[PDB]
Amino acid sequence: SKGEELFTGKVPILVELDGDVNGHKFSVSGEGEGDATKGKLTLKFICTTGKLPVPWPTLVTTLVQCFSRYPDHMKRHDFFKSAMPEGYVQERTISFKDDGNYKTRAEVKFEGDTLVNRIELKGIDFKEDGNILGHKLEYNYNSHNVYITADKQKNGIKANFKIRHNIEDGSVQLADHYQQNTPIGDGPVLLPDNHYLSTQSALSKDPNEKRDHMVLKEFVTAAGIT
């Protein structure tokens, strides 16, 4: 568990997302810090191409689970830190009920002293006046428990979870995530028993930021094995 030693205090984070949703190209940059000893993340994201052409909350899961707090007794189950500093690939499909889907490929790794999440996101088949292209999601985020399982075929982990996005008319739209992560390096990694990450998020704005942006605060704790 050498990689875990890189997480004993606050670590700078950079996030870069190159997006293309129904051919609408956009870019997001984020910066902040993670403190795995608390399970705490604080980041600010800006859209650098103008207005974000999808709702900010739909990007939260795409925009560093190595910052989860694993209780001492669960530390042998922390795949995410074990893969560091070389990092891991994280790939998802995210299917929005009765609407389109995102497919994402990211690398999460140390680049010098900074933990960097670099993502390409492709979305297709979104509906014109749907909740995504029509920005009908409330600017908020629910708590979710994300179950992690070891990959049965190839040195990584997988997860499947459904995010509940609140819609402006009081409905909820589910985003069904399939996730796979594999190590980038060739060194030993920890393959976990089944457990979950208890993930709380809060979204806000910076009154001084003129660009379209999202301030995110998260607290994430591993659980499910005692």
Where do the structural domains in the chain lie, given as residue ranges?
1-226
Q: How many angstroms separate the CA atoms of 19 and 128, rounded? A: 18
Determination technique for this entry: X-ray
100-119 in b/e burial notation, b at 16+ Cβ within 10 A? bbbebebbbbbeeeebbbbb
Per-residue tokens: 87: 């990092």
Q: How many angstroms separate the CA atoms of 128 and 149, rounded? A: 36
Given the structure tokens 């694993």, which residue do they identify?
70
Q: How many angstroms separate the CA atoms of 97 and 77, rounded? A: 32
151-166 in b/e burial notation, b at 16+ Cβ within 10 A? eeeeebbbbebebebb
CA nearest 119: which of 193, 65, 59, 183?
59
Topology adopted by domain 1-226: Green Fluorescent Protein (2.40.155)
CB hemisphere CA count around 41 (13 angstroms): 29
Q: End-to-end alpha-carbon separation of the chain, Å?
A: 19
Q: How many angstroms separate the CA atoms of 80 and 96, rounded? A: 26
Contact at 8 Å (CB) between 92 and 62? yes
Contact at 8 Å (CB) between 173 and 96? yes
Strands 114-124 and 11-21: parallel
Resolution reached, in Å?
A: 1.1
For 96, residues 6+ apart whose C-beta sits below 8 A from its C-beta are 58, 102, 126, 130, 131, 132, 173, 174, 175
Per-residue tokens: 47: 């859209």
**How many angstroms from the chain centroid is the CA of residue 22?**
21
Tell me how long the chain is: 226
For 51, residues 6+ apart whose C-beta sits below 8 A from its C-beta are 212
What single string gives the DSSP state of each residue in the chain?
Answer: -GGGGGGSS-EEEEEEEEEEETTEEEEEEEEEEEETTTTEEEEEEEETTSS-SS-GGGGTTT--GGGSB--GGGGGG-HHHHTTTT-EEEEEEEEETTS-EEEEEEEEEEETTEEEEEEEEEEE---TTSTTTTT-B-S----EEEEEEE-SSSSSEEEEEEEEEEBTTS-EEEEEEEEEEEESSSS----PPSEEEEEEEEEE--TT--SSEEEEEEEEEEES--
For 186, residues 6+ apart whose C-beta sits below 8 A from its C-beta are none
